[PDB]
A paper describes a structure:
In the present study, we report a PET hydrolase from Cryptosporangium aurantiacum (CaPETase) that exhibits remarkable PET degradation activity at ambient temperatures and high thermostability. Formation of one conserved disulfide bond (DS, C279/C297) and lack of an extended loop in the substrate binding site of CaPETase suggest that the enzyme originated from an ancestor of TfCut2 and LCC rather than IsPETase.
The G196T mutation resulted in positive effects on both thermostability and enzyme activity; thus, we finally generated CaPETaseDS2/DS4/NC1/NC4/HP1/SC2/G196T (CaPETaseM9) by integrating the G196T mutation into CaPETaseM8. CaPETaseM9 exhibited a Tm value of 83.2 °C, which corresponds to a 16.7 °C increase in Tm compared with CaPETaseWT. CaPETaseM9 showed much higher activity at all temperature conditions from 30 to 70 °C, and particularly, showed 41.7-fold higher specific activity at 60 °C than CaPETaseWT. With respect to R198K, the mutated lysine residue moved inward to form hydrogen bonds with the main chains of N195 and D222, thereby stabilizing the wobbly tryptophan-containing loop. Finally, the N109A mutation appeared to strengthen internal hydrophobic interactions.
Residue numbers in the entry: 43 to 299
Write the structure that this text describes.
């Protein structure tokens, strides 16, 4: 009845799995304009189309530092566009412009354009790449979701955002501290469903290593908004429990949406 739902009915185990139910293919990004290249990941099952998410790096870093996300998310039934920025010191707004340029490359020019539903797109990023999501969402309010991982931006006013927003913060992150970055961003968004999850003891580099707590909620957010898949509302609402000895130290959201 929802034509965009993919994969079997989920469970806590299915969303925590390193590999989802979709076999994954991959290839480098070759010939693209408006960003630095990178790597695409996608289901090999071409019986149907899938939503796509672009993922942008941010701490003076390259795609390799986020690459575990490519198979982790593509295997749940998404095309993942993991990009290099034009330069490793690009500012956040240019990174947002590059996220949109990578989505346009993927849907109009990439070898896998035919298995993307160009109407169902999302953007994500770490650090300054996460900071770029304000530009991406406010320049392209048709996006279905944005997901910021330790997002960094001097611009604290994200009230322009009308796209469902998930932020992950790290309790031990001194570079993009929740108090100065993610939480102000989250508090400023008044026109979109939103979700903030803070990982205990996690430093600015938490997104750069396989992290099941981050992955499960990233997957759930993509499913809910990119695929309209209300089978995944159960993991988002109420969402994680919080505590100093738990993986999650803080949790805020607009459940029930």
């Amino acid at each position: 009845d929802n034509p965009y739902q993919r994969g079997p009915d989920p469970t806590n185990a299915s969303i925590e799995a390193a590999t989802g139910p979709f076999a994954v293919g991959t290839q480098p990004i070759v010939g693209a304009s408006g960003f630095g290249g990178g790597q695409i990941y996608y289901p090999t099952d071409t019986s149907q189309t899938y939503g796509a998410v672009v993922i942008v790096p941010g701490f003076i870093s390259v795609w390799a530092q986020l690459a575990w996300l490519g198979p982790r998310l593509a295997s749940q039934g998404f095309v993942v566009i993991g990009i290099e920025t034009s330069t490793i010191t690009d500012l956040p707004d240019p990174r947002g412009d590059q996220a949109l340029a990578a989505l346009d490359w993927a849907t109009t020019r990439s070898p896998v354009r035919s298995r993307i539903d160009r109407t169902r797109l999302a953007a994500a990023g770490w650090s300054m790449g996460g900071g770029g999501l304000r530009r991406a969402a406010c320049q392209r309010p048709s996006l279905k979701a944005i997901v910021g991982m330790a997002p960094w931006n001097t611009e604290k006013n994200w009230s322009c955002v009308t796209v469902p927003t998930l932020f992950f913060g790290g309790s031990s992150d001194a570079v993009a501290s929740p108090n100065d970055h993610a939480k102000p961003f989250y508090n400023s968004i008044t026109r979109a469903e939103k979700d903030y999850i803070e990982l205990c003891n996690a430093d600015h580099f938490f997104p750069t290593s396989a992290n099941t707590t981050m992955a499960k909620y990233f997957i759930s957010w993509l499913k809910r908004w990119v695929d309209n898949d209300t089978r995944y509302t159960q993991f988002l609402c109420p969402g994680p429990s919080t505590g100093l000895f738990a993986p999650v130290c803080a949790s805020m959201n607009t459940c029930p949406f």
